[PDB]
Amino acid sequence: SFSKEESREFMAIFPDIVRDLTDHTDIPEVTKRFAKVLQYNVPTGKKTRGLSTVIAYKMLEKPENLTPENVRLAGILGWCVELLQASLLIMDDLMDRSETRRGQPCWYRQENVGFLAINDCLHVESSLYSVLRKYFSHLPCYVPIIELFHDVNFKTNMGQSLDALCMKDGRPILSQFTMKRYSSIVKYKTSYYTFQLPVSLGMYLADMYDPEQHRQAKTILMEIGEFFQIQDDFLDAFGDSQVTGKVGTDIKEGKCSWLAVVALQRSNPAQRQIMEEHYGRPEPESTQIIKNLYIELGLPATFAVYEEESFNIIRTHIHQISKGLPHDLFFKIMKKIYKRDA
Amino acid sequence: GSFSKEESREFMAIFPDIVRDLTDHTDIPEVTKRFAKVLQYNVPTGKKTRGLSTVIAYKMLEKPENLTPENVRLAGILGWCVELLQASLLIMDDLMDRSETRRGQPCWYRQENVGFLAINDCLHVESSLYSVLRKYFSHLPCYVPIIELFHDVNFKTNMGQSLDALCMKDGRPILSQFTMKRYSSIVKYKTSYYTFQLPVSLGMYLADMYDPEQHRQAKTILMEIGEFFQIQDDFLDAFGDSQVTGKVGTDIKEGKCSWLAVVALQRSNPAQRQIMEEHYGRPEPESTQIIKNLYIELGLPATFAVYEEESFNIIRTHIHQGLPHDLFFKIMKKIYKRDA
Ligand SMILES: C=C(C)CCOP(=O)(O)OP(=O)(O)O
Ligand SMILES: C=C(C)CCOP(=O)(O)OP(=O)(O)O
Ligand SMILES: C=C(C)CCOP(=O)(O)OP(=O)(O)O
Ligand SMILES: C=C(C)CCOP(=O)(O)OP(=O)(O)O
Ligand SMILES: [Mn+2]
Ligand SMILES: [Mn+2]
Ligand SMILES: [Mn+2]
Ligand SMILES: [Mn+2]
Ligand SMILES: [Mn+2]
Ligand SMILES: [Mn+2]
């Protein structure tokens, strides 16, 4: 349901994650510093992935099996996803040369961090397998959960690589900016870790190992992932940095974003040359010239129309879900993200 | 095993399968073909001591009658999982230490159209070893312990790296904290766990040796060999031939808490100590050459050569004291007097 009481239930676990990873008695300098890394980077987001892990479980598990112990375990799995999100955001902000994350200067920009952000990134990722070891190592779901986290990370790395290959020799490859390429990027970059991981982690905690059941969840959770990333791409250019918590860099970094794809689809020959000349430039005047074209092409209105159609199209596909999977779970995910401004 | 040609041929024959197993996700050939390039350029170009050690350890810890071609090749695949971890750590390290060359070629992040994308490749190469472990070990009792060992050693290595990186604050090195105590802590976490304990511990788990005391006996002697090994690397950074070592040292420029910088301060007169304060951890080429000229004036090359001989003999005395001694003698014989 994504309610005040669940947000308070979830934030109550976080102190214990910090204690489990920091409280290696011969290097207190580093354990104390890693508490700061966790405190800064892990808990200040919307925590949708982590809260979806708990909601997924509660709606897949048999009502009679929903003990306070079993709910807490779903809470700890959640925070393991947020640990992965944290690691990915530390790296992403370095690679995309971002200014602000979640309302604060990006970790790598801070006084004595810089490239040390690369090590923190890797440290925050490996720390979740330590949390998994302490709480799940005596449960049937231990190996499958470990393997899902390894597979999802590998797939997320490939997403991030395909995302980075938008530029060669300082200029974007606008000829290759297709909706086919776009769909491949968000599938691997976003959908696997953001949407599949929480729901699958819910299924494994409930002992739901049926391959066809996971396959039915995957198909709709990929559609939701695409829908989600298109929202992120819109906000990067037209969002309020005060509300979103970040300054957009998609245009400056010359990303194959949903905006850039649709811009090219609808551009006249003079508008295409603008894109050629000014897309993916370090100059502020170029970024504004591109945003001005985006405005000119009615991409705000175009996004808003798509969002509403896509919401309805996805809902129709959720009503057709089979293999005894709960519909409401997927309606509840869509309700939480539909028309978001952060 | 004895680090022989045939053992390098046996170990290099598995590598094509590792690249096949990770790259041959059919809807994105652009990324899988690029990752085959990332692997080819970053994994097998080292000496491969860690990976070859993992095979040698197993051969010497497993019962002679249980050494099948199947079991030896599994120890090899474990060897490559160690070389994948190494490959990922080196990509990250070169970005952080602002290094020019690695293994005779430009550092990965300096290559045309890499840059900060080297941060993704770093992460991507580490996660790829857990895909290899899954395929070949998921049915064995040693699966979970081997998964966990890697996770633990990675976490430990990350903490090593951080301590190493806190040598500087506000552009100046913290020379008053450059002790042998701090140094022994850096190398323990940064080098010894993944370079020496990991191969041997993997060879034990594949031989179904789960006795904690046996892992604790091996650990004690392998921690000594790691400290020895890192001191050798610290000497080469400043006095090594870059054409031979394959890398241009940056320890003086980055103001690292290296053995050389620790011993320099221990023996420095008050004029020599101010030279360090003024010129250590400076980007300017003239500052790096002044420090190397001070290092030569404190007879540090002769100091290292004496230490290397002493420690080599002291460790051999510790090895003599049901684990196979020749394993630890053969590792020490490989790295003793090395110039790369
Ligand atoms: C996949 C993307 C777009 C990264 C950010 O995800 P969120 O927008 O959910 O970020 P937080 O709330 O966790 O900061
Ligand atoms: C792997 C991640 C973080 C998802 C997409 O990255 P983006 O770069 O598009 O994410 P934001 O910085 O816009 O949150
Ligand atoms: C921990 C250190 C000093 C990294 C280099 O190790 P090696 O000198 O074994 O590197 P390669 O053989 O793999 O190049
Ligand atoms: C690679 C790791 C984690 C060890 C760090 O040692 P260095 O930073 O000195 O590595 P080299 O360049 O000397 O190989
Ligand atoms: Mn970004
Ligand atoms: Mn990005
Ligand atoms: Mn974005
Ligand atoms: Mn280093
Ligand atoms: Mn280095
Ligand atoms: Mn070195």
Side-chain angles (χ1 to χ4, degrees):
Chain A
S1 216
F2 301 108
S3 66
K4 300 189 204 176
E5 66 178 326
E6 305 202 1
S7 207
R8 85 155 179 266
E9 181 210 73
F10 185 66
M11 272 309 301
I13 299 159
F14 185 61
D16 282 343
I17 297 284
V18 166
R19 275 188 279 274
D20 291 344
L21 296 172
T22 62
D23 207 11
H24 300 123
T25 58
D26 67 337
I27 47 160
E29 256 199 271
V30 189
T31 57
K32 280 175 63 195
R33 181 186 176 281
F34 189 60
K36 187 176 191 179
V37 174
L38 291 170
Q39 201 167 244
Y40 271 53
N41 298 291
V42 185
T44 67
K46 293 183 304 308
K47 293 179 284 295
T48 298
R49 294 165 190 76
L51 292 168
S52 298
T53 306
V54 176
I55 296 160
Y57 182 63
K58 284 181 170 151
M59 297 189 76
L60 288 166
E61 183 59 289
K62 308 206 189 297
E64 55 249 31
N65 296 355
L66 285 183
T67 64
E69 286 74 12
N70 292 325
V71 162
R72 193 156 196 275
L73 287 184
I76 298 169
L77 277 186
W79 277 112
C80 289
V81 180
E82 291 303 331
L83 284 172
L84 180 69
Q85 169 70 327
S87 64
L88 287 166
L89 262 49
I90 290 165
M91 171 208 54
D92 185 67
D93 283 325
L94 194 40
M95 281 178 59
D96 300 350
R97 295 181 173 92
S98 284
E99 290 168 39
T100 61
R101 173 64 74 184
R102 293 166 177 170
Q104 308 296 343
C106 296
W107 183 242
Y108 81 92
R109 294 182 66 218
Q110 298 233 56
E111 257 229 358
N112 293 310
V113 180
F115 282 130
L116 183 48
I118 302 159
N119 186 65
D120 307 326
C121 162
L122 282 152
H123 200 184
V124 173
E125 177 225 309
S126 78
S127 75
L128 79 90
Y129 297 95
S130 188
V131 172
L132 288 176
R133 181 175 170 169
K134 175 164 184 154
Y135 288 117
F136 297 86
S137 67
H138 65 303
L139 297 185
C141 61
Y142 185 53
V143 164
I145 285 172
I146 290 289
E147 287 186 353
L148 177 70
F149 263 110
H150 290 151
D151 185 47
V152 167
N153 203 327
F154 185 90
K155 283 169 158 63
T156 304
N157 289 322
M158 273 189 297
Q160 188 72 336
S161 284
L162 191 56
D163 183 280
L165 287 179
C166 60
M167 295 269 276
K168 89 187 158 216
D169 303 8
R171 306 303 312 125
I173 47 160
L174 294 170
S175 73
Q176 293 186 359
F177 284 28
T178 60
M179 196 65 74
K180 183 184 168 288
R181 179 187 197 76
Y182 180 73
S183 285
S184 293
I185 297 169
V186 303
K187 177 185 171 162
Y188 282 97
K189 183 169 106 150
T190 294
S191 299
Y192 271 118
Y193 95 96
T194 298
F195 289 106
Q196 204 224 343
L197 182 58
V199 170
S200 287
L201 283 181
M203 283 188 270
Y204 285 149
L205 192 57
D207 288 305
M208 296 175 85
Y209 300 117
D210 182 21
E212 266 281 342
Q213 227 166 27
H214 284 267
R215 187 160 309 109
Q216 282 282 333
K218 189 183 184 266
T219 296
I220 201 79
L221 287 168
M222 288 303 111
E223 290 188 58
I224 296 164
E226 185 156 318
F227 174 93
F228 178 82
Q229 191 55 49
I230 287 171
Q231 285 177 324
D232 189 78
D233 293 355
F234 174 68
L235 292 168
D236 187 90
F238 295 103
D240 187 357
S241 72
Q242 293 284 71
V243 172
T244 59
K246 69 216 177 170
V247 177
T249 60
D250 282 354
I251 299 158
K252 175 164 70 72
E253 297 299 326
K255 298 291 170 176
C256 191
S257 81
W258 185 80
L259 286 193
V261 174
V262 176
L264 292 172
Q265 283 174 7
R266 292 158 74 108
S267 276
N268 65 43
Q271 289 172 323
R272 174 54 174 255
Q273 285 312 279
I274 283 165
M275 280 294 280
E276 305 287 357
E277 198 184 341
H278 292 294
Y279 202 71
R281 296 289 193 178
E283 296 99 340
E285 98 269 324
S286 281
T287 293
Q288 188 61 59
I289 289 162
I290 298 296
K291 184 175 179 177
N292 288 5
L293 168 62
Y294 279 8
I295 290 166
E296 185 167 27
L297 280 167
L299 286 198
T302 304
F303 165 68
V305 161
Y306 168 86
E307 195 182 19
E308 186 191 334
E309 281 169 355
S310 195
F311 173 75
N312 291 323
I313 295 292
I314 289 163
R315 279 187 62 90
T316 289
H317 295 154
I318 293 170
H319 276 117
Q320 290 161 350
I321 282 172
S322 54
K323 266 64 196 198
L325 280 168
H327 294 195
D328 296 4
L329 172 56
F330 303 109
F331 290 138
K332 274 173 181 193
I333 287 168
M334 284 304 289
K335 186 205 177 176
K336 173 58 171 180
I337 67 169
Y338 181 40
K339 287 197 154 171
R340 72 192 179 89
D341 63 6
Chain B
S2 330
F3 294 109
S4 316
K5 157 162 177 183
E6 221 70 62
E7 321 214 330
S8 282
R9 226 177 94 168
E10 192 199 75
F11 185 63
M12 274 313 296
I14 300 156
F15 183 68
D17 262 30
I18 297 291
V19 170
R20 213 98 277 178
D21 299 343
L22 293 174
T23 63
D24 214 7
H25 307 117
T26 64
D27 59 328
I28 45 162
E30 255 174 62
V31 190
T32 59
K33 284 166 58 223
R34 181 186 175 281
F35 192 62
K37 183 184 199 161
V38 168
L39 290 167
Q40 283 279 2
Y41 281 56
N42 297 279
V43 185
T45 42
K47 297 174 291 285
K48 296 174 280 290
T49 303
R50 291 170 190 71
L52 289 165
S53 297
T54 305
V55 178
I56 295 159
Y58 175 66
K59 288 182 163 205
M60 294 190 82
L61 289 167
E62 181 69 287
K63 316 211 165 292
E65 259 202 63
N66 288 6
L67 292 183
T68 61
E70 285 79 28
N71 292 121
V72 165
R73 196 159 94 73
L74 279 189
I77 297 164
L78 281 179
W80 280 111
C81 289
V82 178
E83 290 294 344
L84 285 169
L85 178 64
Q86 168 76 333
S88 80
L89 287 167
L90 294 194
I91 291 167
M92 148 162 72
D93 186 63
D94 291 3
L95 201 32
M96 286 179 60
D97 300 344
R98 298 166 171 95
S99 292
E100 292 163 11
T101 64
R102 169 67 70 175
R103 297 168 172 178
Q105 309 140 58
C107 298
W108 181 237
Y109 80 90
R110 291 180 77 229
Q111 294 255 337
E112 267 205 358
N113 295 305
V114 179
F116 295 135
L117 183 47
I119 308 161
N120 191 53
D121 298 332
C122 168
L123 279 158
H124 195 185
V125 170
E126 174 226 297
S127 274
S128 70
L129 78 86
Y130 296 104
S131 286
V132 172
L133 288 179
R134 176 168 172 166
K135 180 164 184 203
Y136 293 108
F137 301 92
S138 58
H139 66 289
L140 298 185
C142 61
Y143 187 48
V144 169
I146 284 172
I147 293 296
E148 288 181 352
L149 179 61
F150 268 104
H151 290 142
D152 195 54
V153 168
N154 181 20
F155 186 87
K156 278 170 163 60
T157 306
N158 286 123
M159 280 186 300
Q161 191 70 349
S162 295
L163 194 61
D164 187 288
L166 293 178
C167 59
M168 294 271 273
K169 93 180 90 187
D170 310 351
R172 306 305 310 119
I174 47 162
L175 287 178
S176 61
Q177 292 189 30
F178 281 28
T179 59
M180 200 66 78
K181 190 216 206 289
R182 181 186 191 75
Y183 180 73
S184 283
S185 305
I186 294 171
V187 308
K188 178 186 173 181
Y189 284 89
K190 177 179 99 160
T191 286
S192 291
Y193 273 113
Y194 98 85
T195 304
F196 287 107
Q197 204 219 300
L198 179 61
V200 174
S201 292
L202 286 173
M204 285 179 80
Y205 283 145
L206 191 65
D208 289 314
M209 296 169 83
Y210 300 105
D211 177 25
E213 281 291 350
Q214 234 171 352
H215 282 265
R216 278 212 287 268
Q217 190 93 25
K219 191 203 195 96
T220 305
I221 197 75
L222 291 164
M223 288 296 106
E224 297 182 44
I225 295 172
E227 181 152 310
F228 174 91
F229 179 89
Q230 190 51 72
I231 289 169
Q232 288 180 318
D233 186 81
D234 284 13
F235 174 65
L236 292 172
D237 193 279
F239 294 107
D241 179 10
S242 62
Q243 293 140 113
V244 171
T245 63
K247 66 199 170 176
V248 171
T250 63
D251 279 351
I252 296 164
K253 174 166 67 76
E254 296 301 317
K256 296 289 168 194
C257 183
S258 68
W259 188 80
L260 289 187
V262 171
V263 173
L265 297 171
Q266 282 176 359
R267 293 156 76 110
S268 275
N269 71 21
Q272 291 171 320
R273 175 54 178 259
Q274 298 305 289
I275 285 167
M276 290 288 278
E277 301 275 17
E278 198 181 351
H279 290 287
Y280 201 70
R282 295 284 199 182
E284 290 90 359
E286 70 260 29
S287 279
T288 290
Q289 191 57 53
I290 288 159
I291 296 300
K292 184 178 181 171
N293 283 350
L294 170 62
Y295 279 4
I296 294 165
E297 159 161 49
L298 258 133
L300 287 195
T303 299
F304 164 66
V306 164
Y307 168 89
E308 198 190 26
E309 195 183 11
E310 271 176 8
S311 260
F312 165 86
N313 287 333
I314 293 290
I315 288 164
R316 275 189 61 88
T317 285
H318 286 157
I319 289 168
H320 277 122
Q321 294 164 355
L323 284 175
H325 292 188
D326 302 318
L327 175 56
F328 305 101
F329 289 142
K330 272 172 181 205
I331 288 173
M332 280 307 291
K333 188 171 184 175
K334 175 56 179 186
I335 66 164
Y336 182 43
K337 289 231 226 88
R338 75 188 179 82
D339 71 0

